[PDB]
Amino acid sequence: AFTVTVPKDLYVVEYGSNMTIECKFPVEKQLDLAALIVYWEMEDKNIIQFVHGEEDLKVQHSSYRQRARLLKDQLSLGNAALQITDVKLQDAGVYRCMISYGGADYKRITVKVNAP
Template sequence: ILTLASLPLKSDCRILTFIFVFSATSQIIGPSHLVVALLGADVVLPCHLEPADDLTSKSLEWGRLDLEPRFVHVRHSGQDLQNQNLGFKGRTSLSTEKLKRGDLSLTLSDVKLSDNGTYRCYMVSEDMESNVQLLVGAASSPFITGIDRSGGSVVLECTSSGWYPEPEVSWMDSEGHLVSAGPPETVRGPDDLYTVSSRVTVDKRHGSTVTCRVHQDRTNQTRLTQIRVSGRNHNRTEQTWGSFLVTLTEL
C-alpha cells in the first residue's frame, strides 16, 4: 500500500514522503473456542490458511502430540497417506474442494471418548501450525421413580446414565425454583461414562409437580424430566417427557 504526503516548503518545491506498508505474511488460523461433539457424532476441526491459497499439493499434517504415533491424518504432495494412528483409521478426511480455498479443516467421524484432546493442524513446508481443542461429551435423559411414601409425602429418585463429563443434577418445583434435595451420587462406569442419581421428598398434594434437571456446563447439554404427584385414587403419578405422558404407579 502506497500513500503520499506532501510537505510545503518556503519555495515552490515540495518534499514527497513515501510510506510503504507490506501485507502480513500467511498464517494458519484455528478456532478461538473449544470444539464440542457428542459421542458417536461427526465433528469438523476448523483450520484454514489466511490469506487463502490452493493447498491441494501441499504437505499437511493433523496430529495429537500426546499419542504415539502422533499422526491423525497426513497428506503429502496431494495424496492422503496411511501412516496414521490406528485409533483414527477410516475416520478422518480432508475435502479437496475446501483445500483449493485454503481450508484444512479435518472431519472426524464417529467420535469416541478417546478422541478428547488437543489437535495440531500443521503445514509442513511452511512450518506453520494451529491448535484445536476437542471435547467429546455424552448425555442421556433422566428417569424418575417413586421409591418410598409415607403420610402426605413421597420420596422420588432421579437417575441418568451415560454422561461425559460428569454432570450436575438438581430439582425444581412447578415455578422453576430449586428444591432442596439430598447429595447426589455419582458412579463412573468401565466405559468412562457417568451415572448420577438424586433423591428428593415432596408433598403428595394434588397437582404437585417437580422437575429433575441434569446439566453438563462444558458441553452445554441439559436433559429434563418432569413428574406430577397426584392426590387421586390408586396413588398414581404422571411422568412427562417431551410431548408424551407416561403414567406410573408409585411404589
C-alpha cells in the same frame, strides 16, 4: 508472514455425532499441490499426512482408520478441514494443525467429548 488461522479453538461435541474442525491458511489465486503439506495430529498419533498431493494410510494411526478424512473440496478455498466420524471418548484432547505452504505455522484446537 505466513499465518494459520482457526475460527474456533474449542469444540464441544456429543458422543456418537460427527465433527469437522476447521483450519485455514491463505491461498492466493490457485492451489499448487506440489508446494502444500498438511499434517493433522493429536497427542502423538498420526491422523493425516498429506504431502504434495498424496496421503499414506500405512503411517496413519490405527485409532483413526476409516474414521478420518481431509475434505479436499475446500483446500482450494484455503480450508484444510479434518472430519472425524462417530466421535468416541478417546478422541478428546488437543489437536494440532500444521501446514506448510509458502511458509509455516500451526495452531491448537481443544476437543471435549460429552459422556453418553
